[PDB]
Amino acid sequence: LHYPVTRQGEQVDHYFGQAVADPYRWLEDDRSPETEAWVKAQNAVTQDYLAQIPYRAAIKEKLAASWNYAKEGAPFREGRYHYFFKNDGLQNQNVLWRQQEGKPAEVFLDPNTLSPDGTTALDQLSFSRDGRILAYSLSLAGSDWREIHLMDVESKQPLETPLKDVKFSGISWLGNEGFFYSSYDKPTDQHKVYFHRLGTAQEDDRLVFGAIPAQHHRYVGATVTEDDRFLLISAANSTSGNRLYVKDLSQENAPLLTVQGDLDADVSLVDNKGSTLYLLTNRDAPNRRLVTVDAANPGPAHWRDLIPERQQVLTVHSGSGYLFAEYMVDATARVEQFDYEGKRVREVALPGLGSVSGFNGKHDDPALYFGFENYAQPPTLYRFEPKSGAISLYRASAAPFKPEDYVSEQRFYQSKDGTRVPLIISYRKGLKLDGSNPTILYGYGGFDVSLTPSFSVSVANWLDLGGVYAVANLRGGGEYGQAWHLAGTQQNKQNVFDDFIAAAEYLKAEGYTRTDRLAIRGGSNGGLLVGAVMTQRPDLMRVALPAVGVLDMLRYHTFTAGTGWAYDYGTSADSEAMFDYLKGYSPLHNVRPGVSYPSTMVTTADHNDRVVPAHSFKFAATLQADNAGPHPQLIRIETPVAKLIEQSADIYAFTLYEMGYRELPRQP
């Protein structure tokens, strides 16, 4: 294996009187002739190395064959039909089907064919209270503009001419009379709420909110409660904070009452019961709380906590006369069922530890549906009986992976300083803890980002090859509260790396794998994680896979988009202490001559605004110049799902090959 020559320049930088050489400074220009030629030469060496891997084509074949599969959503009743979305696996847009009990299912609305070349997309969908009329918004191209169409659902023909010039709008019906929507014009950065009455022309739509000076806002929204009693109007100027107003529709010409008159917090309607409003908000509660207040005097001073804020971020769903609080605890789903009076009915017995969605329904739905998935289980739909709490399988995934063939377990290990850290491990059933299993340990560790379980075909293929997939919930993440995040920032960043090293040691100590059967992986802040751990403990793993990483911690902030990461990392310009700390772990600056590094495959696109290739380019150049051991230090520069399949195949093939496998660990 002969690496392309990478010339070293003479650039030398200085920080607080300290000199730091940057011989690959020229690689920071990803569009210069010399860099683009380097990229081409590196890719040639990498492709040549990968070409010798015997089973690379077989891995790619299985990935491609299992990548696409049919999907179906939960059914919902509107009028005399149950509607549900489906996707055959290749369709660009989901297709809406419907079925009347006692009859066969039929296609109801196929967005793909709304325009030859399928450039017309289905956005909002909203049926009248009786389900006889459907109002839905469509978008053309990558346009923010919308048209609201009105269809008679039985004949499937247009009821009226579509509403035009709609933008950033919801569609909320008031019974079967008409619906509220938002628009900037009549019917200029002044968003307004309008009411369209069925049987009338758009030009006659009543202006509801937003015209007088005190109501001028860039974004407004309107929602009518399911019982048609209240109109809630939200108004905002940006993504942070919104005012909220309520109007009692059961009263003749009721004025708007102020639920929240400032933009200091987010607050939104969950539902009402009688004159009681149920609101989800982050006002004085960053993790959110569910509150109630009487609609006749709805100001924040009167809000009463129904579900007080907790350490975990709250998501609320309502259905069948119950409220459901969803949280991710130790990074996995927990759902609690409450009645509208605040009594906790039960903790819902979810199918296992994973991620969920759903529990959304109408007041009178006899059952609710929820989706569940994790590293070893494809998205599956379950039916939930609200009264009994009974759960049953509604639709198994069409993905070519049977959940019963896999195992997912959560363990907790201790980091160097005693901190207990969560670790989710997945594999094919029948695995033995004899320390021989090829394992990929994945982590991120930063920016309050939580690593929660999610199914991916690529990971599932790894498990079928006989691999173990482990994900550590390191400090710096969002799995707990602010202290957990902060414990992995600025001058505490080392904790993240120590947490990851401890996960690798735990996997070995527990018999899942061993040093020559272990690979570590991560992207972006996760790439930094890999770069840092492989430079501090190059002997801990056999393979290192840093993707799109931030690897030059001394100059990351001077690059495009780097300024936004300053809160988590700090910059070499902050102070001598911050500079010394950053230089202490910066991967680029900690690669050393004579050291034997693990087999490495650095990955990145040839051009990137978020995380510039410069990081990966300079890091790969330095590994190639400094590594003295037998392992290859390669870089794969990306120049559709086709590319994703090729990327995953190269990584798994490279990983197994570097571990010495002549054949797959297990025949999939």
Binding site: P286, N287, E309, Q311, Q312, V313, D448, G478, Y480, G481, Q482, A483, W484, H485
Partner: peptide
Amino acid sequence: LPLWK
């Protein structure tokens, strides 16, 4: 406050 997020 404290271990809160």
